[PDB]
mmCIF file of C-alpha atoms and ligand atoms in Angstrom:
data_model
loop_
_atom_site.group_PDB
_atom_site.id
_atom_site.type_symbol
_atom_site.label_atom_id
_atom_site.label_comp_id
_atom_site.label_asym_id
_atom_site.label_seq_id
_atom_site.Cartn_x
_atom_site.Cartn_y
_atom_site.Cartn_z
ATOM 1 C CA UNK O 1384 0.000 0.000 0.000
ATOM 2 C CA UNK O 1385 1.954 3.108 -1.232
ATOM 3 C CA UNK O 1386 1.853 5.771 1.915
ATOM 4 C CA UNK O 1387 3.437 9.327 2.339
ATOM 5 C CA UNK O 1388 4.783 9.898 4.859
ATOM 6 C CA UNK O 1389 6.279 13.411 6.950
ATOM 7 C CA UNK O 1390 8.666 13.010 9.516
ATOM 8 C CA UNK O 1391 7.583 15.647 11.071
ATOM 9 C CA UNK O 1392 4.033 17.578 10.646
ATOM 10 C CA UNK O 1393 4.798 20.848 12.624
ATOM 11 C CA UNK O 1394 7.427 23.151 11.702
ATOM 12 C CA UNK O 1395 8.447 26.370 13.705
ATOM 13 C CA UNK O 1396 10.266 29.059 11.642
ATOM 14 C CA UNK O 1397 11.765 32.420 11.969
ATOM 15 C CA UNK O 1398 11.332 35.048 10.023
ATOM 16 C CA UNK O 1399 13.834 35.474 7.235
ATOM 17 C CA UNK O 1400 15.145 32.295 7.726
ATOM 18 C CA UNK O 1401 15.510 28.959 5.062
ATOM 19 C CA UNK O 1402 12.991 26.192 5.644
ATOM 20 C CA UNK O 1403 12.813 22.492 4.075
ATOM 21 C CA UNK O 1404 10.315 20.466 4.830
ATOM 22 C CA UNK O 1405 10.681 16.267 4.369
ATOM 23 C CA UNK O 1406 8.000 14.103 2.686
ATOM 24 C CA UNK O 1407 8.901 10.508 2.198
ATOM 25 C CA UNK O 1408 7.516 8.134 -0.455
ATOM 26 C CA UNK O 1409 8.861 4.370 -0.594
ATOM 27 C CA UNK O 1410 11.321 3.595 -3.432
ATOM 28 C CA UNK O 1411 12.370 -0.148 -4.131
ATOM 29 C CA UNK O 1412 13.609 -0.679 -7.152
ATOM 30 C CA UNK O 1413 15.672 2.041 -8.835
ATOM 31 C CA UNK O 1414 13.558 5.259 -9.037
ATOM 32 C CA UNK O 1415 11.497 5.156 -12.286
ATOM 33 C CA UNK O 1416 11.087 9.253 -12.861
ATOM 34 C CA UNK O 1417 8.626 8.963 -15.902
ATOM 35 C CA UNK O 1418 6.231 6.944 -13.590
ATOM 36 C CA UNK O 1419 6.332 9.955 -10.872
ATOM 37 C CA UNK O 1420 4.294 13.020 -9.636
ATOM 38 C CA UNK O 1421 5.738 15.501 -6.610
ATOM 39 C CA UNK O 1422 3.280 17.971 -6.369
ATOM 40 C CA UNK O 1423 3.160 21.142 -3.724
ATOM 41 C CA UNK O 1424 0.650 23.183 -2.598
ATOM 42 C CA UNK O 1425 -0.385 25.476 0.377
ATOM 43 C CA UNK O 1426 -4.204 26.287 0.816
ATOM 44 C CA UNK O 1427 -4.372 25.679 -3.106
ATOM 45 C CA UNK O 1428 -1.325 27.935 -4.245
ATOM 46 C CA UNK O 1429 1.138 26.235 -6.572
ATOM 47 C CA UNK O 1430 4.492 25.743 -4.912
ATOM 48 C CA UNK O 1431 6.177 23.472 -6.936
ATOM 49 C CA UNK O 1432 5.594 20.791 -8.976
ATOM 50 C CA UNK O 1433 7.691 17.749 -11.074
ATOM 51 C CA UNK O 1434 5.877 15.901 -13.567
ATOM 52 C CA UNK O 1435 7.294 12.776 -15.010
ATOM 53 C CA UNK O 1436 9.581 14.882 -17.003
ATOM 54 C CA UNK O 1437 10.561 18.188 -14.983
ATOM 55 C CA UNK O 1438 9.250 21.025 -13.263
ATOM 56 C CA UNK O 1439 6.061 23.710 -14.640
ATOM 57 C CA UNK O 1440 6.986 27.255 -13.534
ATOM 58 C CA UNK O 1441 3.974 28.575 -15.303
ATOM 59 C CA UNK O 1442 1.548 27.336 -12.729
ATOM 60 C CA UNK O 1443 3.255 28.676 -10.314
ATOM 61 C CA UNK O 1444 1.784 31.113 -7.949
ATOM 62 C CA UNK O 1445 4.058 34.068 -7.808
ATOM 63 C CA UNK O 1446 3.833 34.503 -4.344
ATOM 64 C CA UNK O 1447 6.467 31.128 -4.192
ATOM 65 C CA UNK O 1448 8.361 32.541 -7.260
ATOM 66 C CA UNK O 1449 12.398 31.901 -6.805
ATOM 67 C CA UNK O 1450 11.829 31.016 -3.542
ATOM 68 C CA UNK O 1451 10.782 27.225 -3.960
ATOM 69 C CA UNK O 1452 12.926 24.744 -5.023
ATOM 70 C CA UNK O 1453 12.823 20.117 -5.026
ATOM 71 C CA UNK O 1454 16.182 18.920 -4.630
ATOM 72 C CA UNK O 1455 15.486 16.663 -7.521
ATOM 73 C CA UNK O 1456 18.535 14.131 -6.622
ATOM 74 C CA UNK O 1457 17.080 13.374 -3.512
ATOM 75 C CA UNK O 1458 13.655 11.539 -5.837
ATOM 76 C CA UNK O 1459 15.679 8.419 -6.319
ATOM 77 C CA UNK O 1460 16.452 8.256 -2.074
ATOM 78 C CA UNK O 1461 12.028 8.774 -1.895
ATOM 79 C CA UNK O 1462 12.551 12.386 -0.310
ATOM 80 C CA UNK O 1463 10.666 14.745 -2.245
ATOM 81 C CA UNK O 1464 12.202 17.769 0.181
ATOM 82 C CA UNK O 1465 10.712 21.347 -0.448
ATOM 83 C CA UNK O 1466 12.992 24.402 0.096
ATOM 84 C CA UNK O 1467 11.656 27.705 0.827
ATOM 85 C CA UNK O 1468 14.151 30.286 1.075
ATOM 86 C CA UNK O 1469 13.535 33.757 2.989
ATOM 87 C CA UNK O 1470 10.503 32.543 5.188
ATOM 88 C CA UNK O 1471 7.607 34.995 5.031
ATOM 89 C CA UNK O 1472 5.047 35.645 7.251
ATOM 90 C CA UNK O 1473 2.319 34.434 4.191
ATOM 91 C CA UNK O 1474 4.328 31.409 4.210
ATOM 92 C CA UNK O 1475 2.342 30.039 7.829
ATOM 93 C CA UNK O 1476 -0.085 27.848 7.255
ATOM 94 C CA UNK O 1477 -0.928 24.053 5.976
ATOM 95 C CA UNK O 1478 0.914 22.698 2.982
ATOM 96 C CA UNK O 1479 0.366 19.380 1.585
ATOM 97 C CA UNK O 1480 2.459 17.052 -0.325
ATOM 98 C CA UNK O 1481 1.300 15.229 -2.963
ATOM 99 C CA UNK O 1482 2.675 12.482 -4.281
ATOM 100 C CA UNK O 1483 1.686 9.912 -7.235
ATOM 101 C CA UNK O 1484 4.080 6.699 -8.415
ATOM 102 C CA UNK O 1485 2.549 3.467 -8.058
ATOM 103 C CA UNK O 1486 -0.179 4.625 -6.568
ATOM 104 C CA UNK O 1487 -0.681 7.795 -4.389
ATOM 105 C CA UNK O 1488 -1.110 9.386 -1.272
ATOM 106 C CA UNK O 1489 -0.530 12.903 0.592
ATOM 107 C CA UNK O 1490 -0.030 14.634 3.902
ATOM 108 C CA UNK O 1491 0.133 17.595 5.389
ATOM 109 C CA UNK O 1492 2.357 19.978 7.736
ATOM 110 C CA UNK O 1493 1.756 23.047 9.365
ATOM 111 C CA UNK O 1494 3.981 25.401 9.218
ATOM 112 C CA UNK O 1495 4.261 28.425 12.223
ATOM 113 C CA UNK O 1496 6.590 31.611 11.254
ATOM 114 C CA UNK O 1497 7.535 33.649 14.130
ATOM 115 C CA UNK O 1498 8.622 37.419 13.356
ATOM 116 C CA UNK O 1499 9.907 40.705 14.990
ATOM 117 C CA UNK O 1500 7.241 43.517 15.619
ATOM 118 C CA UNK O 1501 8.818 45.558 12.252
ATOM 119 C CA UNK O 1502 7.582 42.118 10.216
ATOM 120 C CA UNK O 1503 4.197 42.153 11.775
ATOM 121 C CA UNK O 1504 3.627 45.763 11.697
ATOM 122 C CA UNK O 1505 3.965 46.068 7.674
ATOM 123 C CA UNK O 1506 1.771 43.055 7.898
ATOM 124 C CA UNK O 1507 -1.159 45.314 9.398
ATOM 125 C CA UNK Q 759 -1.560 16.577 -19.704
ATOM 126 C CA UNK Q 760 -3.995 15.222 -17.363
ATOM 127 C CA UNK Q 761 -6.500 17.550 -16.173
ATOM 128 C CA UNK Q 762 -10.050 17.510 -13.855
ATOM 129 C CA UNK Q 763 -12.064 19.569 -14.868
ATOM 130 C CA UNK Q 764 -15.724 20.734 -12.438
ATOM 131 C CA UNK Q 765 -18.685 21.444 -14.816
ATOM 132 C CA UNK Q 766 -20.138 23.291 -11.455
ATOM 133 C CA UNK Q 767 -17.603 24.955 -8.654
ATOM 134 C CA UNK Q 768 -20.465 25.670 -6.404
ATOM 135 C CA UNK Q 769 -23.285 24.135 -5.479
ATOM 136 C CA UNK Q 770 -26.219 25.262 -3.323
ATOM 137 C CA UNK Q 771 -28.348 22.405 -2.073
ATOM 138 C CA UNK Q 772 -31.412 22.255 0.511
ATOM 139 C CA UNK Q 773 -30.631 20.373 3.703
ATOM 140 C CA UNK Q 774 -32.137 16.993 3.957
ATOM 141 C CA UNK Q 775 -32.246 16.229 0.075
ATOM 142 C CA UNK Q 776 -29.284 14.288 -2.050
ATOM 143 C CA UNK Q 777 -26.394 16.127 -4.169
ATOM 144 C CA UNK Q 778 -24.324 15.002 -6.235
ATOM 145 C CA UNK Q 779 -21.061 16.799 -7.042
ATOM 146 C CA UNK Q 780 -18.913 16.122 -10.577
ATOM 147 C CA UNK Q 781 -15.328 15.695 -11.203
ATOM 148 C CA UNK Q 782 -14.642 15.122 -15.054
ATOM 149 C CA UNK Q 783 -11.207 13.234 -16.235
ATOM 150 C CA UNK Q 784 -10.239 12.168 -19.266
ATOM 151 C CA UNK Q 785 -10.954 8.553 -20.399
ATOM 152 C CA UNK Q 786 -9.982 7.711 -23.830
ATOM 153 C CA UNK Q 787 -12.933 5.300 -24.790
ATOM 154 C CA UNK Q 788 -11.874 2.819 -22.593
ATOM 155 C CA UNK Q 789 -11.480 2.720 -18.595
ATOM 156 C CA UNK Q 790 -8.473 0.987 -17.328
ATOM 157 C CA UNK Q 791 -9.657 0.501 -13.946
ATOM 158 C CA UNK Q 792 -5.708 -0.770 -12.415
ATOM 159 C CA UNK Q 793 -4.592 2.549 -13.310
ATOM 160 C CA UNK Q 794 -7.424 4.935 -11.757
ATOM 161 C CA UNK Q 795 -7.352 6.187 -8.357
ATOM 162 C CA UNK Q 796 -10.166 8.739 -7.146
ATOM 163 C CA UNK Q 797 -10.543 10.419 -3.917
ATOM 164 C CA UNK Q 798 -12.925 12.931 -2.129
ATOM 165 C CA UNK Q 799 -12.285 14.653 0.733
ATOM 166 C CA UNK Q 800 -13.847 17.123 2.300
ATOM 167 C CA UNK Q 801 -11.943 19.725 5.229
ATOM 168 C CA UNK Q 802 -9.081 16.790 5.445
ATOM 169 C CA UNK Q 803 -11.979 14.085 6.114
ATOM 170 C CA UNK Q 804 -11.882 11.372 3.822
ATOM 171 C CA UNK Q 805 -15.292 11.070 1.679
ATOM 172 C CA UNK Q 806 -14.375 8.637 -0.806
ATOM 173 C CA UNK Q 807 -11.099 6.079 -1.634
ATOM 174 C CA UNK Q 808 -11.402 4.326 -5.183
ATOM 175 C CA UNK Q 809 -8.574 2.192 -5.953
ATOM 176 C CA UNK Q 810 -8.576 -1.024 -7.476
ATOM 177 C CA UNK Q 811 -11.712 -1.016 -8.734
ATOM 178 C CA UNK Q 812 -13.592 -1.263 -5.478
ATOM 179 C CA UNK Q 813 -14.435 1.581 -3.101
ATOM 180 C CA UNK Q 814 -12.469 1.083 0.097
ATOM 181 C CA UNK Q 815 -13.161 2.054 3.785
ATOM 182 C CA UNK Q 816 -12.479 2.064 6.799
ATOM 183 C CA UNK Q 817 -10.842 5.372 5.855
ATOM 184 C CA UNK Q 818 -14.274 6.838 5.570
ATOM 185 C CA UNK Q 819 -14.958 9.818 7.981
ATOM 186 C CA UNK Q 820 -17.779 8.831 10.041
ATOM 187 C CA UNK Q 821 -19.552 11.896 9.624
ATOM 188 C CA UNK Q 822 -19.637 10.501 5.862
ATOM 189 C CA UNK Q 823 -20.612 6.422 6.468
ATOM 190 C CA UNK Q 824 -23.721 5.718 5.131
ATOM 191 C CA UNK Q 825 -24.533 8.785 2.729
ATOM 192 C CA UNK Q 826 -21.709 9.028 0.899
ATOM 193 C CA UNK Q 827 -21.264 6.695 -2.321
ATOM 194 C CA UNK Q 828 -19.193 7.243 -5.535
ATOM 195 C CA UNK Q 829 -21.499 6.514 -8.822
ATOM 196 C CA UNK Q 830 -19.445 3.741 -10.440
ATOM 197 C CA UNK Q 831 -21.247 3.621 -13.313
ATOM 198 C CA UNK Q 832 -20.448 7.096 -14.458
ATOM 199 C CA UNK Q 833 -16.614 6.303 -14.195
ATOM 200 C CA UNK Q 834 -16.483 4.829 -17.810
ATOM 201 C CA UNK Q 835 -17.748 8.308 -19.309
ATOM 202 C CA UNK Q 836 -14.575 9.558 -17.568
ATOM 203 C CA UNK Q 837 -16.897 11.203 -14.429
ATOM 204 C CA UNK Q 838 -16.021 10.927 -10.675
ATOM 205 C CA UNK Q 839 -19.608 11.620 -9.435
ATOM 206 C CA UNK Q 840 -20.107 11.899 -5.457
ATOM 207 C CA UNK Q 841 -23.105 11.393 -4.178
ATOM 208 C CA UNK Q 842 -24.382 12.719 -0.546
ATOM 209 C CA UNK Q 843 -27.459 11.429 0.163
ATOM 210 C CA UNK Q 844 -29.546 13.774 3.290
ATOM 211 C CA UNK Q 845 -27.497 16.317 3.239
ATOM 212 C CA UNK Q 846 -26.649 18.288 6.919
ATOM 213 C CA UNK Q 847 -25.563 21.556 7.417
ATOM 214 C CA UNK Q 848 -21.799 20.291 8.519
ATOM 215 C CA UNK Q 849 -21.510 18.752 4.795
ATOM 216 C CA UNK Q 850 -21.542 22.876 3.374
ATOM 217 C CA UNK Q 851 -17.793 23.667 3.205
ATOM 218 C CA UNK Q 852 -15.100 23.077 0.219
ATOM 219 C CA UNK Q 853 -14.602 19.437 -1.110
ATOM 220 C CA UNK Q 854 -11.761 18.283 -3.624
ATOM 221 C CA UNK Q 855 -11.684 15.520 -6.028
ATOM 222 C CA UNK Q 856 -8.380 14.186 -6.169
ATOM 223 C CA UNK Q 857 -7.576 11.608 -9.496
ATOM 224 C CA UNK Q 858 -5.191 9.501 -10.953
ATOM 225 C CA UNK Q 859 -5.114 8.289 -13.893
ATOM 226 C CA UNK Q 860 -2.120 8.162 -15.674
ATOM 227 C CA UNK Q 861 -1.579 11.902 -14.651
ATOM 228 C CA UNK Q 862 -2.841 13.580 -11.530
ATOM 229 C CA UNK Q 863 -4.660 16.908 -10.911
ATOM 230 C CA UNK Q 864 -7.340 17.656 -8.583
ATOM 231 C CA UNK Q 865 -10.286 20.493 -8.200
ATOM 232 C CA UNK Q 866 -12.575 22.449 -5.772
ATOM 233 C CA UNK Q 867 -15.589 22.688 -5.265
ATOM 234 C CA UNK Q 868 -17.789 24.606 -2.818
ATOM 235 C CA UNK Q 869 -20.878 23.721 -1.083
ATOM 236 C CA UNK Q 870 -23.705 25.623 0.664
ATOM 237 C CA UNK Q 871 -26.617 24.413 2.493
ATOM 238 C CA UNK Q 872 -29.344 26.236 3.353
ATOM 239 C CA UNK Q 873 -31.784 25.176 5.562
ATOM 240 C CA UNK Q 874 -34.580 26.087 8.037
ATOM 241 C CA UNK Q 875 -34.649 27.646 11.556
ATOM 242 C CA UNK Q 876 -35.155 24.244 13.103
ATOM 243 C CA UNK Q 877 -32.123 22.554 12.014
ATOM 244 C CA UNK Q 878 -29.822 25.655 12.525
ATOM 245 C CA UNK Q 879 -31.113 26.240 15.706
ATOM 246 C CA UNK Q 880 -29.507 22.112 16.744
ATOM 247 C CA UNK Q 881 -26.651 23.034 14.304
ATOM 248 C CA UNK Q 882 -25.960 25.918 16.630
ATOM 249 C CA UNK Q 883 -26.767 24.191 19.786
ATOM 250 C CA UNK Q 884 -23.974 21.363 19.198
HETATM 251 C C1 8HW J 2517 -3.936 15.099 -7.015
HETATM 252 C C2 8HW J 2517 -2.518 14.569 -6.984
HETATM 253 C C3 8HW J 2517 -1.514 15.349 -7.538
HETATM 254 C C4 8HW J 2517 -1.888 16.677 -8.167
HETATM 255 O O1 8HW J 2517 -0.730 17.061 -8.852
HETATM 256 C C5 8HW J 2517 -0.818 18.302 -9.480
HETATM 257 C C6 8HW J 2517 -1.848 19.182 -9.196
HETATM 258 C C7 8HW J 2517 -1.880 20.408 -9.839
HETATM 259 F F1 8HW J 2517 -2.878 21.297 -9.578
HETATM 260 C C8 8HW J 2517 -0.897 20.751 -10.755
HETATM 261 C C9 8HW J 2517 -0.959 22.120 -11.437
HETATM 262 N N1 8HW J 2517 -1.999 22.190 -12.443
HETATM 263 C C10 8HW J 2517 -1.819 21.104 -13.380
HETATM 264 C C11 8HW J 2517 -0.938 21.570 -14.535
HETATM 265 O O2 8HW J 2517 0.165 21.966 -14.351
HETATM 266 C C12 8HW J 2517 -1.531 21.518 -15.937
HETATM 267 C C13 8HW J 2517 -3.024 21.202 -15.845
HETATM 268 O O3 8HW J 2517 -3.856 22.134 -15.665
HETATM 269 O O4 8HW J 2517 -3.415 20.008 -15.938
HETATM 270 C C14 8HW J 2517 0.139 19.866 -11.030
HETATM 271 C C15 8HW J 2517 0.164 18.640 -10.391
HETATM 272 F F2 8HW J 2517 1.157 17.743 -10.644
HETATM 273 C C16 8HW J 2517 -0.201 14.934 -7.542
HETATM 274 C C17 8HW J 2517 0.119 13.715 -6.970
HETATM 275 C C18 8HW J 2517 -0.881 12.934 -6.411
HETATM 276 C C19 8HW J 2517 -2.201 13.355 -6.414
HETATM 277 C C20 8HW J 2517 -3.248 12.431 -5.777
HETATM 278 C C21 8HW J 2517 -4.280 11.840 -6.518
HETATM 279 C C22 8HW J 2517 -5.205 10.993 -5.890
HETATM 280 C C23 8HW J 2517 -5.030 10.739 -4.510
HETATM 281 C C24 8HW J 2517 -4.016 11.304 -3.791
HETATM 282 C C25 8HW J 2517 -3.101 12.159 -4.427
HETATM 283 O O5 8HW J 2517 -3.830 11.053 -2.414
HETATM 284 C C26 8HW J 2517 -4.927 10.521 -1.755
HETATM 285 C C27 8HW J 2517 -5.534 9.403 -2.582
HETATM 286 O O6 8HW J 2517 -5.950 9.856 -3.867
#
C-alpha cells in the first residue's frame, strides 16, 4: 500500500530564515522518474511541482516565485524535500504534499513563522 | 496533460435532500480501472477512496458512512460523481476531487446548504 509519509508535521520558523520540509515516499527498485508526480501546494497555491519529465513554472503562484525549489537528486532516495528560502510571514499555514508513483497518497504539515514587531507591523 | 475539470464549482443544495457533485477526467474510450485512483475529501476528512476497482473504507470519515457513495457507473464516461445522500448543514464547506489516472490533478468545489430555523437552531446548539 503506497503511503506518504512526513517526519515531522509541525514546523516552527523564523522570520527570514531557510525552511525544508521532508516528505517521504517508498522507493524499491531504482527510481522510475517517468512513472512519478511531486506535487506542492499550500491552501491551493502552486508551490512546486515535477511531472514525469521536470518542473512547470507557469503554474506557479508568484507569491512562491524563486523562492521554492525540489532537490530533484534526492527523488531516487524517496525524499521529495521542499525548500523555501527567505521565510515569510504568508508562508504560515498548511501545505500538503502530494505524491503519485505506483499509486498515491498525501499529507500535510503546518507550518508556524515567528517574526519581529517591524515584520508584523507592515503586515497590518 | 492530465487535467479535472468541475462542470459546477459551487453548489447550493437544501438540507435533507441528495447532491451530487462532478469531477470530469479524461478517459480515452476505454477505462483501465488498475490505473485509476479517485478520492474525495472534504476539510481533510476522507469522503471517498477508489482504488482497485472497489471503493475502500475504513478510511471513511464517520460523519460521511452511510450517505456518501461514488457513482461507479459514471466512471467509464470519464466522471467521478459523489453522491451525498440527506445532506446536513456540517456537509456545506469546500470538497476536492483528487484523481489519478495516468496523470494527476485535482479540483474544488464549494458547497452551501441552506436550511430552516429548526435545524440551525440544533446546528448551533452542538
Ligand atoms: C492530485 C494529486 C496530484 C496533483 O498534482 C498536481 C496538481 C496540480 F494542480 C498541478 C498544477 N496544475 C496542473 C498543470 O500543471 C496543468 C493542468 O492544468 O493540468 C500539477 C500537479 F502535478 C499529484 C500527486 C498525487 C495526487 C493524488 C491523486 C489521488 C489521490 C491522492 C493524491 O492522495 C490521496 C488518494 O488519492
Amino acid at each position: 500500500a503506497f503511503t506518504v509519509t512526513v517526519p515531522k508535521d509541525l514546523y516552527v520558523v523564523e522570520y527570514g530564515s531557510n525552511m525544508t520540509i521532508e516528505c517521504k515516499f517508498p522507493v524499491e527498485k531504482q527510481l522510475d522518474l517517468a512513472a512519478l508526480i511531486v506535487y506542492w501546494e499550500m491552501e491551493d497555491k502552486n508551490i512546486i511541482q515535477f511531472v514525469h519529465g521536470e518542473e512547470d513554472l507557469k503554474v506557479q503562484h508568484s507569491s512562491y516565485r524563486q523562492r521554492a525549489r525540489l532537490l530533484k537528486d534526492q527523488l531516487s532516495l524517496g525524499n521529495a524535500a521542499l525548500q523555501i528560502t527567505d521565510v515569510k510571514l504568508q508562508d504560515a499555514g498548511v501545505y500538503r504534499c502530494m505524491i503519485s508513483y505506483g499509486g498515491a497518497d498525501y499529507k500535510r504539515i503546518t507550518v508556524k513563522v515567528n517574526a519581529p514587531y517591524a515584520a508584523a507591523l507592515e503586515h497590518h
